[PDB]
Amino acid sequence: KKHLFLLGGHDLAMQTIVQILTDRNVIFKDRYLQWDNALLSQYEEEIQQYGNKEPFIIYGVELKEDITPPTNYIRIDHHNEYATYPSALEQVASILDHPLNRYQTLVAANDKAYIPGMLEIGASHEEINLIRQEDRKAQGVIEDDEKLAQEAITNGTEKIGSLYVVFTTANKFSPICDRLYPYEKLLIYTPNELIYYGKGINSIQKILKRYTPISNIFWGGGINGFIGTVRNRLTTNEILNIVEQIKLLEL
């Protein structure tokens, strides 16, 4: 069986996947996608060419199946119903019998379980900082993202019980998490988007499903990971109601 890898949205783990695939002479396609455009249809041409074509197995790495996969397609993912699975990076390495070196295992732990993940395999303070900086960079965060993050923390943050609630107009949320960490619970929202981080995502999922179909929701990172809504799918009043419901859990 011959492998073809189709890559989803970029971050440090996806960049590490590119390196391993490049080193191992694997057939792969990388359209420089991001978290909010990682659609299988970005690779429609490749699906037409290799789909249902006997020798090949097509591995889709964190791609939304907006078109019907062919019979030789395998989804590689660790979100939603697969939120307990290892990072896509670890799954790809296993497919290729690739032993992850130390840096790569830190990348994988950060990708699946953030700073807590890196701490439980003994990452140092310098290692954690390099990984976070390189992850934000691979996501495309820039200076104006980091500036808006500081603004939201100074002027748009309030703490209710153990829950931080941050209103922001920032495009990228990861700079906010990295500035507020450590925290137990964090809710970041905009007029048309929210992401919740930390303890008890399952009760957050119960709230979200009263307002929107599951196709507008994503989660991962484990029991106390993250759960969010796809940008511009919910109205401001729906977001505001959800925010109130999440605050009520602190009572």
Ligand X SMILES: C[S@+](CC[C@H](N)C(=O)O)C[C@H]1O[C@@H](n2cnc3c(N)ncnc32)[C@H](O)[C@@H]1OP(=O)(O)OC[C@H]1O[C@@H](n2cnc3c(N)ncnc32)[C@H](O)[C@@H]1O
6 class by beta-carbon count within 10 Å (0-12 exposed, 13-18 middle, 19+ buried): buried
Q: Is 174 in the site for ligand X (CB under 6 A)?
A: yes
Task: Please select the residue that binds ligand X; options are 5, 173, 189, 196, rule is CB under 6 A.
Answer: 173
If the CB atoms of residues 53 and 151 are measured against ligand X, the closer one turns out to be: 151
Query: Taking the complex as a whole, how short is the minimal distance between the CB of residue 8 and ligand X, in angstroms?
Result: 7
Task: Please select the residue that binds ligand X; options are 6, 105, 226, 239, rule is CB under 6 A.
Answer: 226
Binding to Mn ion, residues 29-88 (CB under 5 A): 62
Contact range with ligand X by CB under 6 A, out of 90-98, 119-127, 170-178, 234-242:
170-178
Task: Please select the residue that binds ligand X; options are 4, 11, 30, 118, rule is CB under 6 A.
Answer: 11
If the CB atoms of residues 51 and 220 are measured against ligand X, the closer one turns out to be: 220
Question: Pairing mode, if any, of strands 27-29 and 56-61?
Answer: unpaired
Distances (CA, A) of 215 to 135, 212, 218, 233: 26, 8, 8, 10
**Under rule CB under 5 A, how many of the chain's residues touch Mn ion?**
2
Q: Is 225 in the site for ligand X (CB under 6 A)?
A: yes
Query: Taking the complex as a whole, how short is the minimal distance between the CB of residue 38 and ligand X, in angstroms?
Result: 7
Q: Is 164 in the site for ligand X (CB under 6 A)?
A: no
Task: Please select the residue that binds ligand X; options are 211, 218, 243, 247, rule is CB under 6 A.
Answer: 218
Which of 98, 101, 178 lies closest to 136 in space, CA to CA?
Answer: 178
Q: Where is the chain broken, named by the residue before each break, C–N > 2.5 Å?
A: none
If the CB atoms of residues 50 and 201 are measured against ligand X, the closer one turns out to be: 201
Query: Taking the complex as a whole, how short is the minimal distance between the CB of residue 230 and ligand X, in angstroms?
Result: 4
Which of 152, 187, 194 lies closest to 169 in space, CA to CA?
Answer: 152
Residue 102's identity, in one-letter code, is: R
Give the total residue count for the chain.
Answer: 251
Q: Is 60 in the site for ligand X (CB under 6 A)?
A: no
Distances (CA, A) of 135 to 76, 108, 128, 175: 20, 11, 10, 10
